Amino acid sequence: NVIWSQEFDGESLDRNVWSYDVGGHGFGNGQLEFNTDRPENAYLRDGNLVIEARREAYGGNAFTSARIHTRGRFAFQYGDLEARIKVPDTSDGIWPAFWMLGNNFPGTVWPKCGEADILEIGGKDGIAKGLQNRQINCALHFAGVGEQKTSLVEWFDAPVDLHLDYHLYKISWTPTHMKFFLDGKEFGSWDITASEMKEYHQPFYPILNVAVGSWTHSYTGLDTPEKITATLPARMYVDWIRLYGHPETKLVQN
């Protein structure tokens, strides 16, 4: 029961749904890319959203990409949100993500707003073990007991090379759980009923981005332009994002 979707069929990204996060300040992870609002980094073509990371001097950084979200235009609480994505070869450097934030961000500060990562790929462990094209994770980031940052992470070694084709990346979100799926199969699950997880019973909005690098202590382990070996340009193809409604779903389209 699709009740909301972006099919990415047009010639340009719909600014009446999408907003750009612009900057090269590192986004609290020591990221190297400058996320721009230009057509070179986010464009539509052949029924796809393309987010393109490039090795390119821009704004004082050595890479450009894009980070887009629907805050203010689309949010929901409970439902199945799924995206058909072909990720780029991450081959040491590239850090794509499909994730969500609570709809009270940024007024409510992170992570009290709550966060759910549906797909992340390109981690340091994946690099260390030669599983760059296979190892993924989902995650919950929130204010736990005593209102302090808590992180729950579930890793999964995918069976096939994910950058070779489109796959379906989904969250199933109910009043009791958040579950995460690859091609219909569950690889993560958490109960969200506990007193410290009330942040996960409000509307959330989706985010899509392709980051380049991080601090060494952060996701990729690769903190300088010279340590980025990945094939650039790197393109993430999104065929669509669809919300399958539940009885309890609330839609926010203001």
- Residue ranges that bind Ca ion, judged by CB under 5 A: 7-8, 47, 143, 196, 199, 239-240
> Active site includes 120?
yes
Which of the residues 11, 120, 147, 186 is marked catalytic?
A: 120
- The residue (of 43 and 240) whose beta carbon lies closer to Ca ion is 240
Residue least distant from Ca ion (Cβ): 47
CB 212 within 8 A of CB 31: yes
Task: Report in angstroms how near the CB of residue 13 gets to Ca ion at its nearest.
Answer: 13
Task: Report in angstroms how near the CB of residue 88 gets to Ca ion at its nearest.
Answer: 18
Dist CA 142 CA 34 (whole Å): 26
Q: What is the dihedral of CA 250, 118, 215, 213, to 10 degrees?
A: -110
Question: Which residues in the chain belong to E strands, given as ranges?
Answer: 2-6, 19-20, 33-35, 42-45, 48-58, 61-65, 67-69, 75-77, 79-86, 94-102, 115-121, 135-143, 149-157, 167-173, 177-182, 185-191, 204-212, 234-244, 250-252
- The residue (of 232 and 243) whose beta carbon lies closer to Ca ion is 243
Task: Report in angstroms how near the CB of residue 229 gets to Ca ion at its nearest.
Answer: 31
Task: Report in angstroms how near the CB of residue 44 gets to Ca ion at its nearest.
Answer: 9
Among residues 106, 114, 95, the alpha carbon closest in space to that of 208 is found at: 95
> Active site includes 196?
no
Which of the residues 115, 154, 186, 226 is marked catalytic?
A: 115
Positions marked active-site: 115, 120
